[PDB]
Amino acid sequence: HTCDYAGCGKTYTKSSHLKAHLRTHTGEKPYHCDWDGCGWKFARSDELTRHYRKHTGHRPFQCQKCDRAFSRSDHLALHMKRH
DNA sequence: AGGGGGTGTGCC
DNA sequence: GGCACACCCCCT
Ligand code: NA
Ligand SMILES: [Zn+2]
Ligand SMILES: [Zn+2]
Ligand SMILES: [Zn+2]
């Protein structure tokens, strides 16, 4: 599975990863946020899922040193480092 | 400090 | 296919 966009030639082992990679060339953002008044659109479905947590307020990653909770694991990891 | 999007990569 | 981690780079 090779990318035939201009002088690229990037290879992938799965179809889904190449199809998502081609979106970085065509600029297509198929995953729209349906929240009222938002308007954000993303090229990968996981970006929209992560973005929805800002609307829903879901904070699954909880710090065990204090009481702060975060919606993303990297935000919790950085919070633990600079604790 | 907290809070976002972009991107690559490995797993289900 | 999506999910999620990890990291980057940005803004607040
Ligand atoms: Na495939
Ligand atoms: Zn390409
Ligand atoms: Zn939104
Ligand atoms: Zn803490």
PDB file of all heavy atoms in Angstrom, chain A residues 38-72, unseen atoms left out:
ATOM      1  N   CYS A  38     -20.606  24.767  17.254  1.00  0.00           N
ATOM      2  CA  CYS A  38     -19.175  24.491  17.258  1.00  0.00           C
ATOM      3  C   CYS A  38     -18.569  24.739  15.882  1.00  0.00           C
ATOM      4  O   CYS A  38     -17.995  25.804  15.634  1.00  0.00           O
ATOM      5  CB  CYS A  38     -18.902  23.056  17.709  1.00  0.00           C
ATOM      6  SG  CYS A  38     -17.149  22.697  17.938  1.00  0.00           S
ATOM      7  N   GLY A  39     -18.684  23.762  14.985  1.00  0.00           N
ATOM      8  CA  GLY A  39     -18.196  23.902  13.629  1.00  0.00           C
ATOM      9  C   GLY A  39     -16.856  23.257  13.347  1.00  0.00           C
ATOM     10  O   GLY A  39     -16.352  23.391  12.225  1.00  0.00           O
ATOM     11  N   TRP A  40     -16.266  22.564  14.315  1.00  0.00           N
ATOM     12  CA  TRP A  40     -14.977  21.926  14.105  1.00  0.00           C
ATOM     13  C   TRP A  40     -15.127  20.670  13.256  1.00  0.00           C
ATOM     14  O   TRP A  40     -16.126  19.950  13.342  1.00  0.00           O
ATOM     15  CB  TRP A  40     -14.328  21.573  15.443  1.00  0.00           C
ATOM     16  CG  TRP A  40     -13.489  22.673  16.012  1.00  0.00           C
ATOM     17  CD1 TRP A  40     -13.873  23.604  16.932  1.00  0.00           C
ATOM     18  CD2 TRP A  40     -12.122  22.958  15.698  1.00  0.00           C
ATOM     19  NE1 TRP A  40     -12.828  24.451  17.211  1.00  0.00           N
ATOM     20  CE2 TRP A  40     -11.741  24.076  16.466  1.00  0.00           C
ATOM     21  CE3 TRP A  40     -11.182  22.376  14.841  1.00  0.00           C
ATOM     22  CZ2 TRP A  40     -10.461  24.624  16.404  1.00  0.00           C
ATOM     23  CZ3 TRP A  40      -9.912  22.921  14.780  1.00  0.00           C
ATOM     24  CH2 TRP A  40      -9.563  24.034  15.556  1.00  0.00           C
ATOM     25  N   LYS A  41     -14.117  20.415  12.426  1.00  0.00           N
ATOM     26  CA  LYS A  41     -14.063  19.223  11.591  1.00  0.00           C
ATOM     27  C   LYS A  41     -12.657  18.646  11.653  1.00  0.00           C
ATOM     28  O   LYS A  41     -11.674  19.383  11.768  1.00  0.00           O
ATOM     29  CB  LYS A  41     -14.449  19.529  10.137  1.00  0.00           C
ATOM     30  CG  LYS A  41     -14.042  20.914   9.664  1.00  0.00           C
ATOM     31  CD  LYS A  41     -15.058  21.483   8.685  1.00  0.00           C
ATOM     32  CE  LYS A  41     -14.759  22.938   8.357  1.00  0.00           C
ATOM     33  NZ  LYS A  41     -16.002  23.720   8.105  1.00  0.00           N
ATOM     34  N   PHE A  42     -12.567  17.320  11.575  1.00  0.00           N
ATOM     35  CA  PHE A  42     -11.306  16.620  11.762  1.00  0.00           C
ATOM     36  C   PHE A  42     -11.108  15.586  10.663  1.00  0.00           C
ATOM     37  O   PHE A  42     -12.065  15.093  10.060  1.00  0.00           O
ATOM     38  CB  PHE A  42     -11.246  15.945  13.139  1.00  0.00           C
ATOM     39  CG  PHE A  42     -11.588  16.864  14.275  1.00  0.00           C
ATOM     40  CD1 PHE A  42     -12.891  16.969  14.733  1.00  0.00           C
ATOM     41  CD2 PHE A  42     -10.605  17.628  14.881  1.00  0.00           C
ATOM     42  CE1 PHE A  42     -13.205  17.818  15.777  1.00  0.00           C
ATOM     43  CE2 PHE A  42     -10.915  18.476  15.924  1.00  0.00           C
ATOM     44  CZ  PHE A  42     -12.216  18.571  16.370  1.00  0.00           C
ATOM     45  N   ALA A  43      -9.839  15.256  10.418  1.00  0.00           N
ATOM     46  CA  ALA A  43      -9.482  14.260   9.418  1.00  0.00           C
ATOM     47  C   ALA A  43      -9.481  12.839   9.964  1.00  0.00           C
ATOM     48  O   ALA A  43      -9.616  11.890   9.183  1.00  0.00           O
ATOM     49  CB  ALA A  43      -8.105  14.573   8.826  1.00  0.00           C
ATOM     50  N   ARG A  44      -9.329  12.668  11.275  1.00  0.00           N
ATOM     51  CA  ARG A  44      -9.327  11.355  11.904  1.00  0.00           C
ATOM     52  C   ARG A  44     -10.466  11.267  12.909  1.00  0.00           C
ATOM     53  O   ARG A  44     -10.778  12.245  13.596  1.00  0.00           O
ATOM     54  CB  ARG A  44      -7.989  11.070  12.598  1.00  0.00           C
ATOM     55  CG  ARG A  44      -6.875  10.664  11.646  1.00  0.00           C
ATOM     56  CD  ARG A  44      -5.504  10.837  12.281  1.00  0.00           C
ATOM     57  NE  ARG A  44      -5.447  10.293  13.633  1.00  0.00           N
ATOM     58  CZ  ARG A  44      -4.323  10.019  14.280  1.00  0.00           C
ATOM     59  NH1 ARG A  44      -3.139  10.224  13.726  1.00  0.00           N
ATOM     60  NH2 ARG A  44      -4.388   9.529  15.515  1.00  0.00           N
ATOM     61  N   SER A  45     -11.085  10.086  12.989  1.00  0.00           N
ATOM     62  CA  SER A  45     -12.218   9.904  13.890  1.00  0.00           C
ATOM     63  C   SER A  45     -11.806  10.026  15.352  1.00  0.00           C
ATOM     64  O   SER A  45     -12.594  10.505  16.176  1.00  0.00           O
ATOM     65  CB  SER A  45     -12.878   8.549  13.635  1.00  0.00           C
ATOM     66  OG  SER A  45     -13.609   8.114  14.769  1.00  0.00           O
ATOM     67  N   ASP A  46     -10.584   9.607  15.693  1.00  0.00           N
ATOM     68  CA  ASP A  46     -10.129   9.710  17.076  1.00  0.00           C
ATOM     69  C   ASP A  46      -9.946  11.161  17.505  1.00  0.00           C
ATOM     70  O   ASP A  46     -10.032  11.464  18.701  1.00  0.00           O
ATOM     71  CB  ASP A  46      -8.829   8.927  17.265  1.00  0.00           C
ATOM     72  CG  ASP A  46      -7.720   9.404  16.348  1.00  0.00           C
ATOM     73  OD1 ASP A  46      -7.058  10.409  16.684  1.00  0.00           O
ATOM     74  OD2 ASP A  46      -7.509   8.772  15.291  1.00  0.00           O
ATOM     75  N   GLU A  47      -9.691  12.066  16.556  1.00  0.00           N
ATOM     76  CA  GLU A  47      -9.635  13.485  16.895  1.00  0.00           C
ATOM     77  C   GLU A  47     -11.002  13.997  17.328  1.00  0.00           C
ATOM     78  O   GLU A  47     -11.106  14.780  18.279  1.00  0.00           O
ATOM     79  CB  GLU A  47      -9.116  14.296  15.709  1.00  0.00           C
ATOM     80  CG  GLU A  47      -7.839  13.762  15.087  1.00  0.00           C
ATOM     81  CD  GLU A  47      -7.305  14.672  13.997  1.00  0.00           C
ATOM     82  OE1 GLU A  47      -6.866  15.796  14.320  1.00  0.00           O
ATOM     83  OE2 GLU A  47      -7.325  14.265  12.816  1.00  0.00           O
ATOM     84  N   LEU A  48     -12.063  13.566  16.639  1.00  0.00           N
ATOM     85  CA  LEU A  48     -13.408  13.988  17.013  1.00  0.00           C
ATOM     86  C   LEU A  48     -13.818  13.399  18.357  1.00  0.00           C
ATOM     87  O   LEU A  48     -14.420  14.092  19.186  1.00  0.00           O
ATOM     88  CB  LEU A  48     -14.403  13.590  15.924  1.00  0.00           C
ATOM     89  CG  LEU A  48     -15.881  13.828  16.235  1.00  0.00           C
ATOM     90  CD1 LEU A  48     -16.150  15.308  16.454  1.00  0.00           C
ATOM     91  CD2 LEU A  48     -16.758  13.277  15.121  1.00  0.00           C
ATOM     92  N   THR A  49     -13.504  12.121  18.588  1.00  0.00           N
ATOM     93  CA  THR A  49     -13.810  11.500  19.873  1.00  0.00           C
ATOM     94  C   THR A  49     -13.115  12.233  21.014  1.00  0.00           C
ATOM     95  O   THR A  49     -13.726  12.502  22.055  1.00  0.00           O
ATOM     96  CB  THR A  49     -13.403  10.024  19.854  1.00  0.00           C
ATOM     97  OG1 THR A  49     -14.346   9.275  19.078  1.00  0.00           O
ATOM     98  CG2 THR A  49     -13.355   9.458  21.266  1.00  0.00           C
ATOM     99  N   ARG A  50     -11.837  12.571  20.830  1.00  0.00           N
ATOM    100  CA  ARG A  50     -11.122  13.352  21.834  1.00  0.00           C
ATOM    101  C   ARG A  50     -11.731  14.739  21.988  1.00  0.00           C
ATOM    102  O   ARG A  50     -11.831  15.262  23.104  1.00  0.00           O
ATOM    103  CB  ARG A  50      -9.645  13.453  21.455  1.00  0.00           C
ATOM    104  CG  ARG A  50      -8.755  14.038  22.535  1.00  0.00           C
ATOM    105  CD  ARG A  50      -7.304  14.076  22.084  1.00  0.00           C
ATOM    106  NE  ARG A  50      -7.131  14.868  20.872  1.00  0.00           N
ATOM    107  CZ  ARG A  50      -5.965  15.079  20.276  1.00  0.00           C
ATOM    108  NH1 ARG A  50      -4.841  14.572  20.755  1.00  0.00           N
ATOM    109  NH2 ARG A  50      -5.927  15.819  19.171  1.00  0.00           N
ATOM    110  N   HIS A  51     -12.150  15.348  20.877  1.00  0.00           N
ATOM    111  CA  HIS A  51     -12.714  16.692  20.932  1.00  0.00           C
ATOM    112  C   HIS A  51     -14.076  16.709  21.617  1.00  0.00           C
ATOM    113  O   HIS A  51     -14.438  17.711  22.244  1.00  0.00           O
ATOM    114  CB  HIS A  51     -12.820  17.267  19.520  1.00  0.00           C
ATOM    115  CG  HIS A  51     -13.697  18.476  19.421  1.00  0.00           C
ATOM    116  ND1 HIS A  51     -13.273  19.735  19.788  1.00  0.00           N
ATOM    117  CD2 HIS A  51     -14.974  18.618  18.995  1.00  0.00           C
ATOM    118  CE1 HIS A  51     -14.252  20.601  19.593  1.00  0.00           C
ATOM    119  NE2 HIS A  51     -15.295  19.949  19.113  1.00  0.00           N
ATOM    120  N   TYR A  52     -14.837  15.616  21.515  1.00  0.00           N
ATOM    121  CA  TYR A  52     -16.161  15.575  22.127  1.00  0.00           C
ATOM    122  C   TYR A  52     -16.087  15.659  23.646  1.00  0.00           C
ATOM    123  O   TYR A  52     -17.030  16.137  24.286  1.00  0.00           O
ATOM    124  CB  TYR A  52     -16.896  14.302  21.706  1.00  0.00           C
ATOM    125  CG  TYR A  52     -17.812  14.488  20.518  1.00  0.00           C
ATOM    126  CD1 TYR A  52     -17.892  13.525  19.521  1.00  0.00           C
ATOM    127  CD2 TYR A  52     -18.599  15.625  20.396  1.00  0.00           C
ATOM    128  CE1 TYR A  52     -18.730  13.690  18.433  1.00  0.00           C
ATOM    129  CE2 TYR A  52     -19.438  15.800  19.313  1.00  0.00           C
ATOM    130  CZ  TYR A  52     -19.500  14.829  18.334  1.00  0.00           C
ATOM    131  OH  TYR A  52     -20.334  14.999  17.254  1.00  0.00           O
ATOM    132  N   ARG A  53     -14.981  15.202  24.239  1.00  0.00           N
ATOM    133  CA  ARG A  53     -14.854  15.237  25.693  1.00  0.00           C
ATOM    134  C   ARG A  53     -14.841  16.664  26.225  1.00  0.00           C
ATOM    135  O   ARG A  53     -15.214  16.896  27.381  1.00  0.00           O
ATOM    136  CB  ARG A  53     -13.590  14.493  26.127  1.00  0.00           C
ATOM    137  CG  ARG A  53     -13.596  13.019  25.754  1.00  0.00           C
ATOM    138  CD  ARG A  53     -12.779  12.189  26.726  1.00  0.00           C
ATOM    139  NE  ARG A  53     -11.383  12.093  26.319  1.00  0.00           N
ATOM    140  CZ  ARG A  53     -10.901  11.160  25.510  1.00  0.00           C
ATOM    141  NH1 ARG A  53     -11.681  10.226  24.990  1.00  0.00           N
ATOM    142  NH2 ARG A  53      -9.604  11.163  25.215  1.00  0.00           N
ATOM    143  N   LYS A  54     -14.415  17.629  25.405  1.00  0.00           N
ATOM    144  CA  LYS A  54     -14.488  19.027  25.814  1.00  0.00           C
ATOM    145  C   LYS A  54     -15.931  19.506  25.911  1.00  0.00           C
ATOM    146  O   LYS A  54     -16.234  20.397  26.712  1.00  0.00           O
ATOM    147  CB  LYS A  54     -13.700  19.903  24.841  1.00  0.00           C
ATOM    148  N   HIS A  55     -16.828  18.932  25.106  1.00  0.00           N
ATOM    149  CA  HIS A  55     -18.237  19.304  25.176  1.00  0.00           C
ATOM    150  C   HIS A  55     -18.960  18.544  26.281  1.00  0.00           C
ATOM    151  O   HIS A  55     -19.787  19.120  26.995  1.00  0.00           O
ATOM    152  CB  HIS A  55     -18.918  19.052  23.830  1.00  0.00           C
ATOM    153  CG  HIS A  55     -18.506  20.006  22.752  1.00  0.00           C
ATOM    154  ND1 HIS A  55     -18.546  21.374  22.913  1.00  0.00           N
ATOM    155  CD2 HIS A  55     -18.052  19.788  21.495  1.00  0.00           C
ATOM    156  CE1 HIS A  55     -18.130  21.958  21.803  1.00  0.00           C
ATOM    157  NE2 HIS A  55     -17.825  21.018  20.927  1.00  0.00           N
ATOM    158  N   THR A  56     -18.664  17.252  26.433  1.00  0.00           N
ATOM    159  CA  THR A  56     -19.345  16.433  27.427  1.00  0.00           C
ATOM    160  C   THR A  56     -18.763  16.593  28.824  1.00  0.00           C
ATOM    161  O   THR A  56     -19.456  16.303  29.804  1.00  0.00           O
ATOM    162  CB  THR A  56     -19.289  14.956  27.028  1.00  0.00           C
ATOM    163  OG1 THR A  56     -17.927  14.511  27.029  1.00  0.00           O
ATOM    164  CG2 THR A  56     -19.881  14.753  25.643  1.00  0.00           C
ATOM    165  N   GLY A  57     -17.515  17.041  28.939  1.00  0.00           N
ATOM    166  CA  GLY A  57     -16.883  17.156  30.237  1.00  0.00           C
ATOM    167  C   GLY A  57     -16.378  15.854  30.811  1.00  0.00           C
ATOM    168  O   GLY A  57     -16.132  15.777  32.019  1.00  0.00           O
ATOM    169  N   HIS A  58     -16.215  14.824  29.984  1.00  0.00           N
ATOM    170  CA  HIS A  58     -15.746  13.531  30.465  1.00  0.00           C
ATOM    171  C   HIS A  58     -14.262  13.610  30.799  1.00  0.00           C
ATOM    172  O   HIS A  58     -13.442  13.947  29.939  1.00  0.00           O
ATOM    173  CB  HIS A  58     -16.007  12.453  29.416  1.00  0.00           C
ATOM    174  CG  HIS A  58     -15.791  11.058  29.915  1.00  0.00           C
ATOM    175  ND1 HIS A  58     -15.879  10.721  31.249  1.00  0.00           N
ATOM    176  CD2 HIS A  58     -15.492   9.912  29.257  1.00  0.00           C
ATOM    177  CE1 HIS A  58     -15.644   9.429  31.391  1.00  0.00           C
ATOM    178  NE2 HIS A  58     -15.406   8.915  30.198  1.00  0.00           N
ATOM    179  N   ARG A  59     -13.917  13.301  32.049  1.00  0.00           N
ATOM    180  CA  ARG A  59     -12.536  13.327  32.529  1.00  0.00           C
ATOM    181  C   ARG A  59     -12.214  11.968  33.138  1.00  0.00           C
ATOM    182  O   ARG A  59     -12.261  11.795  34.363  1.00  0.00           O
ATOM    183  CB  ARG A  59     -12.321  14.456  33.538  1.00  0.00           C
ATOM    184  CG  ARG A  59     -12.043  15.806  32.899  1.00  0.00           C
ATOM    185  CD  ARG A  59     -12.669  16.936  33.695  1.00  0.00           C
ATOM    186  NE  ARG A  59     -12.469  18.227  33.047  1.00  0.00           N
ATOM    187  CZ  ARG A  59     -12.555  19.397  33.664  1.00  0.00           C
ATOM    188  NH1 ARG A  59     -12.839  19.480  34.954  1.00  0.00           N
ATOM    189  NH2 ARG A  59     -12.353  20.513  32.969  1.00  0.00           N
ATOM    190  N   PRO A  60     -11.875  10.978  32.306  1.00  0.00           N
ATOM    191  CA  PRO A  60     -11.636   9.626  32.837  1.00  0.00           C
ATOM    192  C   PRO A  60     -10.313   9.478  33.566  1.00  0.00           C
ATOM    193  O   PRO A  60     -10.192   8.585  34.414  1.00  0.00           O
ATOM    194  CB  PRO A  60     -11.680   8.736  31.582  1.00  0.00           C
ATOM    195  CG  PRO A  60     -12.123   9.640  30.445  1.00  0.00           C
ATOM    196  CD  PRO A  60     -11.748  11.026  30.842  1.00  0.00           C
ATOM    197  N   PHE A  61      -9.320  10.311  33.265  1.00  0.00           N
ATOM    198  CA  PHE A  61      -7.989  10.186  33.850  1.00  0.00           C
ATOM    199  C   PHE A  61      -7.925  11.019  35.125  1.00  0.00           C
ATOM    200  O   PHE A  61      -7.886  12.253  35.069  1.00  0.00           O
ATOM    201  CB  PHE A  61      -6.925  10.620  32.846  1.00  0.00           C
ATOM    202  CG  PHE A  61      -7.027   9.920  31.521  1.00  0.00           C
ATOM    203  CD1 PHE A  61      -7.609  10.547  30.433  1.00  0.00           C
ATOM    204  CD2 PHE A  61      -6.549   8.628  31.367  1.00  0.00           C
ATOM    205  CE1 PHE A  61      -7.710   9.902  29.213  1.00  0.00           C
ATOM    206  CE2 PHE A  61      -6.647   7.977  30.151  1.00  0.00           C
ATOM    207  CZ  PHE A  61      -7.229   8.616  29.072  1.00  0.00           C
ATOM    208  N   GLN A  62      -7.909  10.344  36.271  1.00  0.00           N
ATOM    209  CA  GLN A  62      -7.899  10.993  37.573  1.00  0.00           C
ATOM    210  C   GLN A  62      -6.528  10.853  38.221  1.00  0.00           C
ATOM    211  O   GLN A  62      -5.920   9.778  38.189  1.00  0.00           O
ATOM    212  CB  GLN A  62      -8.970  10.398  38.490  1.00  0.00           C
ATOM    213  CG  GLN A  62     -10.318  11.092  38.398  1.00  0.00           C
ATOM    214  CD  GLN A  62     -11.477  10.173  38.739  1.00  0.00           C
ATOM    215  OE1 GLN A  62     -12.607  10.625  38.928  1.00  0.00           O
ATOM    216  NE2 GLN A  62     -11.203   8.876  38.817  1.00  0.00           N
ATOM    217  N   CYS A  63      -6.049  11.944  38.814  1.00  0.00           N
ATOM    218  CA  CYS A  63      -4.767  11.938  39.502  1.00  0.00           C
ATOM    219  C   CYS A  63      -4.930  11.304  40.878  1.00  0.00           C
ATOM    220  O   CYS A  63      -5.886  11.608  41.597  1.00  0.00           O
ATOM    221  CB  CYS A  63      -4.222  13.362  39.629  1.00  0.00           C
ATOM    222  SG  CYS A  63      -2.931  13.570  40.884  1.00  0.00           S
ATOM    223  N   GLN A  64      -3.998  10.424  41.243  1.00  0.00           N
ATOM    224  CA  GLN A  64      -4.034   9.765  42.541  1.00  0.00           C
ATOM    225  C   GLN A  64      -3.302  10.544  43.627  1.00  0.00           C
ATOM    226  O   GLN A  64      -3.433  10.200  44.806  1.00  0.00           O
ATOM    227  CB  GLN A  64      -3.439   8.355  42.440  1.00  0.00           C
ATOM    228  CG  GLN A  64      -4.304   7.346  41.689  1.00  0.00           C
ATOM    229  CD  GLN A  64      -5.794   7.562  41.883  1.00  0.00           C
ATOM    230  OE1 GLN A  64      -6.294   7.583  43.009  1.00  0.00           O
ATOM    231  NE2 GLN A  64      -6.511   7.739  40.780  1.00  0.00           N
ATOM    232  N   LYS A  65      -2.534  11.577  43.267  1.00  0.00           N
ATOM    233  CA  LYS A  65      -1.876  12.394  44.281  1.00  0.00           C
ATOM    234  C   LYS A  65      -2.792  13.490  44.810  1.00  0.00           C
ATOM    235  O   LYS A  65      -2.645  13.909  45.964  1.00  0.00           O
ATOM    236  CB  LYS A  65      -0.592  13.008  43.720  1.00  0.00           C
ATOM    237  N   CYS A  66      -3.729  13.966  43.991  1.00  0.00           N
ATOM    238  CA  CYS A  66      -4.702  14.959  44.431  1.00  0.00           C
ATOM    239  C   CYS A  66      -6.099  14.581  43.954  1.00  0.00           C
ATOM    240  O   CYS A  66      -6.433  13.394  43.875  1.00  0.00           O
ATOM    241  CB  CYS A  66      -4.314  16.351  43.929  1.00  0.00           C
ATOM    242  SG  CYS A  66      -4.456  16.576  42.142  1.00  0.00           S
ATOM    243  N   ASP A  67      -6.924  15.579  43.634  1.00  0.00           N
ATOM    244  CA  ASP A  67      -8.288  15.341  43.183  1.00  0.00           C
ATOM    245  C   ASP A  67      -8.545  15.810  41.759  1.00  0.00           C
ATOM    246  O   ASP A  67      -9.687  15.726  41.294  1.00  0.00           O
ATOM    247  CB  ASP A  67      -9.289  16.019  44.127  1.00  0.00           C
ATOM    248  N   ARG A  68      -7.526  16.295  41.054  1.00  0.00           N
ATOM    249  CA  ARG A  68      -7.728  16.798  39.703  1.00  0.00           C
ATOM    250  C   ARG A  68      -7.974  15.652  38.730  1.00  0.00           C
ATOM    251  O   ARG A  68      -7.374  14.579  38.842  1.00  0.00           O
ATOM    252  CB  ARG A  68      -6.519  17.618  39.255  1.00  0.00           C
ATOM    253  N   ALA A  69      -8.869  15.886  37.776  1.00  0.00           N
ATOM    254  CA  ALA A  69      -9.173  14.931  36.722  1.00  0.00           C
ATOM    255  C   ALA A  69      -8.972  15.591  35.366  1.00  0.00           C
ATOM    256  O   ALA A  69      -9.174  16.799  35.209  1.00  0.00           O
ATOM    257  CB  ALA A  69     -10.607  14.402  36.840  1.00  0.00           C
ATOM    258  N   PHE A  70      -8.573  14.789  34.383  1.00  0.00           N
ATOM    259  CA  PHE A  70      -8.268  15.290  33.052  1.00  0.00           C
ATOM    260  C   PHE A  70      -8.941  14.420  32.001  1.00  0.00           C
ATOM    261  O   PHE A  70      -9.229  13.242  32.235  1.00  0.00           O
ATOM    262  CB  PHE A  70      -6.752  15.340  32.811  1.00  0.00           C
ATOM    263  CG  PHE A  70      -6.003  16.138  33.842  1.00  0.00           C
ATOM    264  CD1 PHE A  70      -5.538  15.537  35.001  1.00  0.00           C
ATOM    265  CD2 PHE A  70      -5.773  17.491  33.658  1.00  0.00           C
ATOM    266  CE1 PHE A  70      -4.853  16.269  35.953  1.00  0.00           C
ATOM    267  CE2 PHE A  70      -5.089  18.229  34.606  1.00  0.00           C
ATOM    268  CZ  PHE A  70      -4.629  17.617  35.755  1.00  0.00           C
ATOM    269  N   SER A  71      -9.192  15.017  30.838  1.00  0.00           N
ATOM    270  CA  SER A  71      -9.841  14.325  29.734  1.00  0.00           C
ATOM    271  C   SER A  71      -8.861  13.597  28.825  1.00  0.00           C
ATOM    272  O   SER A  71      -9.297  12.830  27.960  1.00  0.00           O
ATOM    273  CB  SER A  71     -10.665  15.314  28.902  1.00  0.00           C
ATOM    274  OG  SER A  71      -9.832  16.291  28.299  1.00  0.00           O
ATOM    275  N   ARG A  72      -7.559  13.816  28.995  1.00  0.00           N
ATOM    276  CA  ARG A  72      -6.545  13.199  28.155  1.00  0.00           C
ATOM    277  C   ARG A  72      -5.415  12.663  29.023  1.00  0.00           C
ATOM    278  O   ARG A  72      -5.070  13.247  30.054  1.00  0.00           O
ATOM    279  CB  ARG A  72      -5.995  14.192  27.122  1.00  0.00           C
ATOM    280  CG  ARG A  72      -6.940  14.452  25.963  1.00  0.00           C
ATOM    281  CD  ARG A  72      -6.607  15.746  25.247  1.00  0.00           C
ATOM    282  NE  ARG A  72      -5.205  15.818  24.851  1.00  0.00           N
ATOM    283  CZ  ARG A  72      -4.724  16.685  23.971  1.00  0.00           C
ATOM    284  NH1 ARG A  72      -5.509  17.561  23.365  1.00  0.00           N
ATOM    285  NH2 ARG A  72      -3.424  16.673  23.691  1.00  0.00           N
TER     286      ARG A  72
END
